[PDB]
């Protein structure tokens, strides 16, 4: 639990922190891709009209 | 950095991910390619007289 | 220690997959996008 910031030490193990970092970065990348996909689908066919 | 070492480290468990993925895409390709063939070779129902 | 990180990961990933499938199916069946037929 040394790698975890002491704020989140009660919650995150040493290994759980690295997997949490991977999950966070994956969620952020997926969010960017989702925003791009939504902008493209809107420029193509607006669903709200 | 993993939480499922029996699923992502061990060769038998690691293999199960690829097995599931390949089976899902195999079933989807099965259904999709069948319906593609059926709809491309089948003639349109004859126009009503 | 409450809330195992593994549990949150499983729940979030399954919720995201289920929601992606549900939203795709709702959008495809709506025919606003016409199952991509256009």
């Amino acid at each position: 639990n040394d790698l975890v910031p002491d704020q989140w030490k009660p919650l995150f193990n040493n290994a759980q922190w690295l997997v949490h970092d991977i999950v966070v970065k994956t969620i952020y990348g997926g969010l960017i891709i989702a925003v791009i996909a939504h902008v493209l689908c809107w420029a193509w066919t607006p669903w709200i009209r | 950095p993993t939480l499922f070492p029996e699923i992502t480290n061990t060769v038998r468990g690691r293999f199960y991910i690829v097995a599931g993925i390949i089976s899902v895409v195999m079933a989807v390709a099965s259904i999709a390619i069948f319906w593609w063939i059926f709809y491309t070779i089948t003639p349109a129902p004859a126009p009503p007289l | 220690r409450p809330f195992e990180f593994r549990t949150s990961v499983v729940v979030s990933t399954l919720l995201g997959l289920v929601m992606a499938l549900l939203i795709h199916f709702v959008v495809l069946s709506s025919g606003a996008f016409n199952w991509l037929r256009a």
Binding site: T26, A37, L40, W44 | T8, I17, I21 | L36, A38
Partner: peptide, 26 residues
């Protein structure tokens, strides 16, 4: 633009799969 988008989303699916399976298969 629908064929463009379907191809786009399938390749994003595939590349996502190569990335995280690469990690799992590390």
């Amino acid at each position: 633009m629908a064929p463009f988008l379907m191809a786009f989303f399938t390749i994003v699916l595939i590349v996502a799969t190569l990335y995280f399976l690469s990690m799992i298969m590390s």
